[PDB]
Design a protein around this ligand. Structure first.
Ligand SMILES: [Cl-]
Ligand SMILES: [Cl-]
Length: 162
């Protein structure tokens, strides 16, 4: 298992514009297009992202390309972030995947706001961090995906995904 296969299981793949769990316009592998209510603002963003007139539909390759850019941006955002970097550096390879996952879903700002859990992860207090992570809107809103990520942090293995 790796970060790509991990996120592909969590986000799924859709080749037509859809609305995410929060109601925002998304396409492909969890690629947020816009937070605006307008399907037209979404189609515009889409065409801009792909470099062609898409009429709201993309092919697999295009979806995968967006996905590659997004994972790359996620990692690089972690590395440039003063709060996140030290956490990432301290972690093993599996747990690094778990933080990348959170960043991909909720953005660098959002994750960086989990101050207490971050400190617990850094100290390698696994069970405590899992309990703290669960007291969040995140876990309450997407509990199945959250539990999987949390288990990855608790255990350090890919069990939740197998
Ligand atoms: Cl983009
Ligand atoms: Cl869920």
């Amino acid at each position: 298992m790796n970060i790509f296969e991990m996120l592909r299981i969590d986000e799924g793949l859709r080749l037509k514009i859809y609305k995410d769990t929060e109601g925002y316009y998304t396409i492909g592998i969890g690629h947020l297009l816009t937070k605006s209510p307008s399907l037209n603002a979404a189609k515009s963003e889409l065409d801009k992202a792909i470099g062609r007139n898409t009429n709201g539909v993309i092919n697999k390759d295009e979806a995968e390309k967006l996905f590659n850019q997004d994972v790359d941006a996620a990692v690089r955002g972690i590395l440039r972030n003063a709060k996140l970097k030290p956490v990432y550096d301290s972690l093993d390879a599996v747990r690094r995947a778990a933080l990348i996952n959170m960043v991909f879903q909720m953005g660098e700002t959002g994750v960086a706001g989990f101050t207490n859990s971050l400190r617990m992860l850094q100290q390698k207090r696994w069970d405590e961090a899992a309990v703290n992570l669960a007291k969040s809107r995140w876990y309450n809103q997407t509990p199945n995906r959250a539990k999987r990520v949390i288990t990855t942090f608790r255990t350090g293995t890919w069990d939740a995904y197998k």
